[PDB]
Symmetry: C2
Subunit: 73 residues, 2 copies
């Protein structure tokens, strides 16, 4: 359950081989992540500062728990 | 005319004080740029290498000449 990467449209927009494994093209860890229970304003600040769109939210061990984005609102 | 930066949707997406100048909310030089007459596949390779949707095409002096984007490809 520990995070090892992330994949988005910018990571695979023009990739030719659809057989490419996730580990081959994913954005390698470490990444910009927050802890469980992180405040919404802190998440917005991280999103604006790092200009990443999908911010993962991690537990106190390294296993992913959630993802923060205002689009649900 | 010296290309000193670039401002895209992400920089200005969630800014509140819209009265701020561009230089305060722009990505400053040096940018990821290519020479005039750069090959299409070379430009695509650079775009995927930096995973950025804008590529300024500049003269050797650094004067802006053109704007390649990822959605054209
Ligand atoms: N939280 C993060 N920390 C670090 N890098 C990230 C994070 N989220 C995404 N990235 C990386 O940033 C790059 C762009 O991801 P982003 O989420 O901005 O793309 P997207 O949502 O698909 O955007 P677009 O609509 O422009 O395609 C990719 O290389 C991706 O792996
Ligand atoms: N040539 C470049 N070199 C370096 N950084 C750049 C370059 N062009 C744009 N940037 C910056 O890289 C970031 C991402 O660029 P990109 O063009 O993917 O964003 P965008 O098109 O506004 O994104 P979206 O479509 O997801 O809203 C922005 O902060 C932008 O200012
Ligand atoms: Mg996007
Ligand atoms: Mg765009
Ligand atoms: Mg886009």
């Amino acid at each position: 359950g520990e995070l090892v990467g992330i994949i988005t449209n910018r990571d695979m927009r023009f990739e030719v081989d659809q057989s490419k494994p996730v580990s081959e093209v994913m954005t390698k860890a470490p990444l910009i992540t927050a802890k469980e229970g992180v405040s919404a304003e802190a998440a917005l600040g991280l999103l604006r500062r790092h200009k990443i769109e999908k911010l993962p939210i991690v537990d106190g061990h390294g296993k992913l728990t959630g993802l923060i984005t205002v689009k649900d609102f």
